[model samples]
Target: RNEVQFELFGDYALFTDPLTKIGGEKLSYSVPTYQALKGIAESIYWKPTIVFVIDELRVMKPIQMESKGVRPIEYGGGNTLAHYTYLKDVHYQVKAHFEFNLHRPDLAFDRNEGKHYSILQRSLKAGGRRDIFLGARECQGYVAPCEFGSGDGFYDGQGKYHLGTMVHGFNYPQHQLDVRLWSAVMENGYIQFPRPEDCPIVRPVKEPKIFNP
Candidate 1:
């Protein structure tokens, strides 16, 4: 059987604008349901040779959350009391599928973005009540693995790698799911899931093999 290594794996946190925090638990800006589902497959040794399938997602918790914080007085006003602002949970479950690619960069680079957009667009088009699920055998999600070549070029003249520019996500045409999506390749060799545009996709080296005639 062919094999490939999964560099990283993770799921979406509930979406929050200022990322609602309780004590120290911070909510996510937006939950990538599709990404979350695919992440599970990657956890179990992901590879393009084998396709991982996700039938459905049960919403254990729909990302419901409450945030509270104190607001100090501005220029010359009295201090405001601590108040509570509750934002609905950003996480939800729907049918989802998973895919993996070990050699295609273009597909990997844009898979999540496509999923995010598809989720929002499909939801809106379906009047906001569609139970979004992964396509069974018929509709399959995809994931791809890539290689990194020449680590020197990515670093600055000082040889320091910068964050924030490492990964990014795109929005759909209807303006839903507008978060810039990408992952950060950490300094300690940890690749945050979903890398950014600047991250170059490395092609595999193919060698010819001779077989007995």
Candidate 2:
């Protein structure tokens, strides 16, 4: 018998628009915080053929709360404060296999936005290994390799827009070993997909020889 049907951390997975209507622009989380994404992925048991859809991810912190303040001999005043205390990173690690799905262009439609079809189509054909970096709050953004352009699309859209080239393997300090394609783009100031020289025909994965105990 099932007692608790599902387990959830009760956290918010959020998204934000690039521009802001308020006075100051909001800062993005500094790291790849994927608890919410991971939760959904786990729920699905990391299955393929089914694409996980995450709609709008909004700011979950700053939960409104009423607070009363006492000053002098006058009446007390109360106001609501919006605060998000958690320093959770916004980036997420999406672990899954890539599929070749160009033949069926019908499946490429995103109801929310029609223009997104081309982006999705290109991603599928690019093959395994891809990551989406949404950018962060401060320091603009570190000079990294990308297919869209030098910086985000704001720079120039005409630059090589291949998905494979922008794969910035791992994050800062870890020295995750940038792949050839990404390295080339970073060095050349342009985008180029990985070729035989980029990845190099390395040895296949096999069981390591166990030394005698």
Candidate 3:
């Protein structure tokens, strides 16, 4: 297995809480979720034959928040005012590794381990193959390779902080859409995530209308 470390930062981020958007207002989580970080890694380098697993994330900056008022376009017509809360001046150091996706046998021909690893390393060094965003498209982000714990962090020794239950990630089966949840906690600035299979609170939310062939 190959592990890579990188630092990601942005001026603002919105890891929106789905439940809080009922009234056209959005709220952000205090920290990034597992799925959000995974998406970032994939943006850096991804292939259909590989699955990126986020090993851990270190909060490198203090968690500050700001809210803004914007007029979101209405689906029917006109525009409506909405408030969106965003994390300001965010930075995180992430460590992750990739594994072969056994489920995607159709992509087995592209599963050359060493070749994929090289491509991923090259992509990271060159700032990724695609544009990177922090949770939302409006929040642009930059990534650079770094030693996982080379620098001082705001919460370096700050004890444990519980973040209650959060969306672990989503599970895409052939028949249904499933959502997973887990209790998130940060200890000494780093948050470790359990593998998707290890999450005990996965539930099917809806049936899928399309299936991968």
Candidate 4:
């Protein structure tokens, strides 16, 4: 298990509020979700054998939002337009660490955390194995090593809010259907997310993949 912290930012972040997503005219959550940050960390350096845990988040910029109108090509001679809201100029300090997954017990022979740490470390320094993409796509983000909470933040002093009943995250490799939802709270724009296994709310959710190559 190794811990890594980084600063992630982008021009826009479009995380669906989910409630408004039963159809169209999407609305974004005012705050980022745990799953979204986890997704970002995975893009940085994911070993199929490693599981990343996003422990905390520090919002470094004002949570500004911008809405845009979209038009589909197949206008179908029809107006299938949608209005989407995105978080503009979003920058967050993410505190994440990881653990080795033993699902593939046979791979115990390769569970060399010592050897793997360097690979993970450099990938962080280099940005990632692949370019980082914010929620959806199009909204690309970047990563750089940082000391968590070291710099000034937009709400560093007096700010507290509760983003009620939001999604905790999703699990895969077996139970991809299940979704975990939880209440989100922020103190001075900071959130300490609970581990997925400990999340109190889980909705309708694993079956596992097998490979002996």
Using lDDT as the measure, which candidate wins? 3
Instruction: Give TM-scores for every candidate, taking all chains together and pairing residue i with residue i.
Output: 0.24, 0.19, 0.92, 0.87
- Model 4 reaches what TM-score against the true structure? 0.87
Q: Highest TM-score among the candidates is held by which one?
A: 3
**Candidates by TM-score, descending order:** 3, 4, 1, 2
Where does candidate 2 clash, by residue pair? 14-57, 15-57, 15-58, 32-91, 62-83, 62-84
Query: Measured by TM-score, how close is model 2 to the native structure?
Result: 0.19
Error of 3 at 121 (Å): 0.8
lDDT of 3 by residue, 45-104 (tens): 998889999989999999998999866556784545788899999999999999989998
lDDT of candidate 2 over 49-164, digit per residue (tens):
22333211222122222222212121452332322222232211132222323444566552322233333334334421233222312111111112221122221333422222
lDDT of 4 by residue, 94-193 (tens): 8988887878776667677776677778998998788787786768889988999997898887577787888888866565567888888889989999
Candidates 3 and 4 compared: the better one by TM-score is: 3
Worst 10 residues of 3 by lDDT: 204-213
What C-alpha RMSD separates each model from the true structure?
20.8, 18.7, 5.4, 7.3
- Whole-structure CA lDDT of model 3: 0.88
Candidate 2 global lDDT: 0.26
lDDT for residue 186 in candidate 3, whole number 0-100:
96
Going through the candidates in the order shown, the clash numbers are 18, 6, 0, 5
